[PDB]
């Protein structure tokens, strides 16, 4: 791929020079969790118990 796509090779070489976003300081390490999609919606379910 890198022997064919010079643009991909250049992106791979130059990706290091990009600085980290400043939004990382606003959150704790455990608060951020990556997911796997590009466009659409996701659903999260939270369960809670109670006494009768």
């Amino acid at each position: 791929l890198f022997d064919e796509n010079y643009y991909a090779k250049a992106v791979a070489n130059i990706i290091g020079e990009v600085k980290d976003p400043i939004m990382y300081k606003w959150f704790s390490p455990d608060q951020i969790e990556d997911v796997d999609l590009q466009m659409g919606y996701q659903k999260t379910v939270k369960w809670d118990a109670f006494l009768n």
């Binding site: 999260t44 379910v45 006494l51």
Partner: protein, 53 residues
């Protein structure tokens, strides 16, 4: 009572009393009951994200 002064001859002396106290701690056993899905039936409710009805 107040102490007794030892002067000349005396036979009646003030006394020091003693007492006992018994302290008891009680315990109670309590129970709750809760409903859940069967292990064999979990496969029929295992969805992609949630795993319960």
């Amino acid at each position: 009572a107040n102490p007794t002064t030892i002067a000349n001859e005396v036979n009646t002396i003030s006394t020091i009393g003693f007492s006992s106290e018994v302290v008891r701690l009680n315990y109670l056993k309590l129970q709750y009951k809760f409903r859940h899905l069967k292990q064999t039936s979990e496969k029929f409710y295992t969805s992609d994200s949630y795993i319960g009805d």
